[PDB]
Amino acid sequence: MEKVAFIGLGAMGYPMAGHLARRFPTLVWNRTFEKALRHQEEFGSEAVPLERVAEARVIFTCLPTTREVYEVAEALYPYLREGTYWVDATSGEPEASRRLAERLREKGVTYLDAPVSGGTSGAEAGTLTVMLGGPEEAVERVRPFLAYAKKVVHVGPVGAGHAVKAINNALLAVNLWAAGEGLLALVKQGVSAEKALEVINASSGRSNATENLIPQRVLTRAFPKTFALGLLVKDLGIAMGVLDGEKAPSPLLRLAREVYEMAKRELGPDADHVEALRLLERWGGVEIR
Amino acid sequence: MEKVAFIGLGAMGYPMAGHLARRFPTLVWNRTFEKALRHQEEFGSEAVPLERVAEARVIFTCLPTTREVYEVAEALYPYLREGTYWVDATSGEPEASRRLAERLREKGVTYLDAPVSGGTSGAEAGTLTVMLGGPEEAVERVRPFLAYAKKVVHVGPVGAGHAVKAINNALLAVNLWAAGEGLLALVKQGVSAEKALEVINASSGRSNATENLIPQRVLTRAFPKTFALGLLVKDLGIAMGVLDGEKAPSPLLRLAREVYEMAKRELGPDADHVEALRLLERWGGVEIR
Amino acid sequence: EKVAFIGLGAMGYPMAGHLARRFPTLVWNRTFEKALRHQEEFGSEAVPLERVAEARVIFTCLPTTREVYEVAEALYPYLREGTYWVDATSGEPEASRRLAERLREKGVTYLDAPVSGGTSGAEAGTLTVMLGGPEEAVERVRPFLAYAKKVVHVGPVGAGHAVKAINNALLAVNLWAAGEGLLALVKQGVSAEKALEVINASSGRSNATENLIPQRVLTRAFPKTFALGLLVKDLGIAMGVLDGEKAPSPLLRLAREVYEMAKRELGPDADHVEALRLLERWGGVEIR
Amino acid sequence: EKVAFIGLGAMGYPMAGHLARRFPTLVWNRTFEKALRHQEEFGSEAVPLERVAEARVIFTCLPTTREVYEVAEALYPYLREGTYWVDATSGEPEASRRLAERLREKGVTYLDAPVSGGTSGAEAGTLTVMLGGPEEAVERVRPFLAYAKKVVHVGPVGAGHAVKAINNALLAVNLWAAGEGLLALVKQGVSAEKALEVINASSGRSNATENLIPQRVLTRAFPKTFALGLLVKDLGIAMGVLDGEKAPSPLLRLAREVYEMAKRELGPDADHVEALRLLERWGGVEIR
């Protein structure tokens, strides 16, 4: 027999747990339990009280922040069995996560930070990129269970995964915002946004941002909700913590956190992350399309 | 075929004019006569004094800046004939170019800004990406003559081509520098720059910078010279002029010009643009690799 | 000798009042009612624009060099040789240099003479003046600056405007940075009153923390004395000064962009100090 | 009542001098020679670190909270109930709150009391003090602040450090922005001397342009009184204060980064004002 479990059935967790459920007997739990019941009916997982999650050989979590991961770890602490692996797909904090790992080790549980990239489309397709942090033996053991992933890279000990994820998202943030500033200026003087992007995406200034986010969500005015702006700002905050390690001159990334915070304050934490460009459109008095 | 003429036989112009020569009777001009004679002997073009360039149906220019384009336009003015087209491959200044376009229009000469991307490699291969600015009809008329290009995009009226070229390079600048800041922080905390990029290039933070510039030129320490840092700062200057049109809040792009200026002053204008990252390495006390 | 003042705005109205008490003063204003009002209040003489040419010294305090150029072109046909044009407008160095050339065609000597001290300074007649132009002309005009106290000759035509632009760029930075810091302190329970009491007796003090924030922000009064739109205009001129050498200027460059944000959200007619309300809106708290 | 001082540095040495001139003072320094020198000069008494616990009020002025904590742990087993700990170190609010709790275990009341006024202010005994802590404790220690003039109670433990950090961040921004502006002006032929004469009589004036730049930069004197490394440390603390609410603070955030550049290139041991030299190196001209 086999048994894994998933906690946190959100935008990412719901589809991620679906891949797990189709492959292994999977127990799922969600604060708003209705979501777990729906998941059971849709994928064949089994909705259970949080405590039963401790029955699994591999526990997965995809929560907002390390804060929530801590809460559920403390709730499960007395029931955790020796030999269990904890795969945290939360975009967490390196330091607080190293502490959590030490704490879980008290029960013989091996924590591995395993944040992902690829968004909800990647979660649904099961092609998420995973950046793992932790012991080499543990990493080898968990690979087969990552049913929702394609590219899996072991980047270092506990905390390195979250650190890499944070920096990756800070780069996405910077690339996206800069492209927004440039497109705003271009559109303002009669340049076709679509044609400009075709050029840019064939040139040196191309990025995932100009290739797969702006054309699809901004020019169309679709602005689909897939990744909360509040969560990206939270990621930028974690990236700032990574920069604090050595504090080498990092003018561009530091500022990136501040402009996205402006967007969060004006648009709300629940707007989609790409909607941050709407702030530039508001100031400019013109839409990017 | 109709006669064409190319002005400016530099690293880009020499090969570009070579592609034209293989298809049409081609007149070539270069400040330094030797280069034109060399081109004539190699491709069968015909080296001529500037004034004879007016014999062409289509005049092409690829000079350092709009200032040089102005100088040659001024000298040719008394000889320009109605029905002529002027394709400017120079990475020019949008506004100054629009003014030039009007003076040329008065002689019955239709100007189109047509900056290019793809570098000397693309010029040699004849696969350059062209961003055209100008009247629809004129664009239709000149497409058949762009023998050195593959992808040809009409981005807007006169000046739009130059604007997109400038903004593209500004985006490249930001993407590259930000990636430098983040990778520096990661390398400093023990994470392999190679491992970090493996994840990033398969994640949302990816860009041409992280995909094709940093791994090949920075991690390898090769730093091949393809585009001078001093020239990138110059393009950033043109990009700042584009931002000045509306002056909508553009903190990120504005800051980008300033940090690259720092690199230009400490590393020298002749260092390669990617070497700008050496400044981060110097401050960081560690190499990105 | 006779003098004249063009542009009776927030600064011009009181500035011309000081001239009127010392010299026969002719005044003109686009919205002529202000000139008539000025005549009744100070004893100056409201006159048609062309009559301004009667003066030995012409003063202007308009929004930008563009408006100064407009009135100069209008007066061109009437200007007399030997006349002086003292421009209190916060103008552009280059355009002003071209204006000086145009005016020399009529034998008129232009000098940029932008000021600092605000409307309170204009009313008190204690304005600081930064002059740009020939030293012979500077010496001839000094006696006429009845609305000024500290007067400094900083260089040739255009130098005064450049210094004013940089001065205001510093004011903007000091003001905004102070805002970001006070906001943070207020958020964690430290009153802006106590914080400023310390700051104004410490190394972080500036004219902004001493004479602007306590009086306009903590009181919630936000009086309108200097348009935010004009300060953004000044920052634009400062960016032009930075473009001369383009040496790394990250802080000043960023300053123009954040004040532009304030302008877009609060409007150009808000007071310059109201820029801090954008910080209050984002922070969800008042700086008090 | 007896007092004691730990950390006879650029600030500590003179500060403890003012104390020794009014109260029985015990002094200690890592490099004991300084303590002996102080004893000979002011009449204080150099003693082993452990003897400091004999004082009613213990004063410290070390590099960072890290050192204060280290000295605290060493003294912990000897601390007496009823003692007060006045920390003049420019410390971290959070770590200082933890330190206060630790000291409370021995019945010792900690108060953050960072200062402003530099070495000249310490020598003159006119330092501004920003106190964080219990009201009753503040009243008890006020009479012992012999090296201060203006003393403000800004909040509970940690608030003093928070205000100092923000104050210094404003100083840093004011200083650097002034550098960027003056550099541009000098490059176009305008004397920094003339520019500052105008600025210090205008809206852009600050303690930085009034008392640091003219005296240290224009003269090329660049005296060493406050390490660049310590200012960057203060900026780092300021960033931590900003992290409380994380309201948009682009200017102050950028300030930490440019001063870091100066530290990397000039070294943490250069004077804080020497940061402007980075601008001079890039600009290729001296600010005069």
Ligand SMILES: NC(=O)C1=CN([C@@H]2O[C@H](COP(=O)(O)OP(=O)(O)OC[C@H]3O[C@@H](n4cnc5c(N)ncnc54)[C@H](OP(=O)(O)O)[C@@H]3O)[C@@H](O)[C@H]2O)C=CC1
């Ligand atoms: N969306 C994306 O594109 C990507 C997001 N991520 C990262 O994945 C993580 C989750 O993101 P996403 O799925 O969008 O988040 P959502 O906001 O969609 O979901 C958050 C989930 O966490 C649960 N939760 C919140 N608070 C608590 C709590 N106190 N106790 C228990 N459960 C709680 C929610 O329960 P409930 O249903 O009850 O509200 C919900 O299942 C984040 O760290 C994010 O940064 C990584 C890559 C991509």
Ligand SMILES: NC(=O)C1=CN([C@@H]2O[C@H](COP(=O)(O)OP(=O)(O)OC[C@H]3O[C@@H](n4cnc5c(N)ncnc54)[C@H](OP(=O)(O)O)[C@@H]3O)[C@@H](O)[C@H]2O)C=CC1
């Ligand atoms: N190199 C690259 O990777 C790319 C460059 N570009 C753009 O192409 C343009 C030129 O670049 P590139 O070919 O590399 O330049 P080079 O420096 O190789 O060549 C410049 C050319 O301009 C001529 N020239 C210089 N000064 C004058 C003058 N005062 N009057 C007349 N001719 C003059 C030169 O003549 P002479 O031989 O006599 O010195 C030479 O032919 C620029 O606008 C650049 O931004 C676009 C994409 C890529």
Ligand SMILES: NC(=O)C1=CN([C@@H]2O[C@H](COP(=O)(O)OP(=O)(O)OC[C@H]3O[C@@H](n4cnc5c(N)ncnc54)[C@H](OP(=O)(O)O)[C@@H]3O)[C@@H](O)[C@H]2O)C=CC1
């Ligand atoms: N306010 C302040 O605290 C300070 C302002 N300055 C500088 O002084 C200058 C004026 O500022 P301020 O007095 O506040 O401005 P206001 O907006 O109060 O006044 C502007 C004045 O210019 C006139 N004007 C505008 N357009 C035209 C035009 N096309 N032709 C003729 N007159 C015109 C107005 O006429 P009308 O009455 O008809 O509207 C008015 O008299 C600016 O350059 C500003 O940056 C310098 C220091 C301080």
Ligand SMILES: NC(=O)C1=CN([C@@H]2O[C@H](COP(=O)(O)OP(=O)(O)OC[C@H]3O[C@@H](n4cnc5c(N)ncnc54)[C@H](OP(=O)(O)O)[C@@H]3O)[C@@H](O)[C@H]2O)C=CC1
């Ligand atoms: N200089 C200024 O203008 C101002 C400085 N401040 C703040 O005051 C504090 C001290 O600054 P300043 O006096 O210039 O510093 P200095 O570098 O001059 O002196 C530091 C002092 O701390 C001592 N010290 C360092 N490390 C240790 C340790 N591990 N254990 C015990 N003692 C140690 C030194 O001992 P030793 O002699 O043995 O090396 C020395 O007495 C800082 O927090 C600074 O930011 C505040 C206002 C102004």
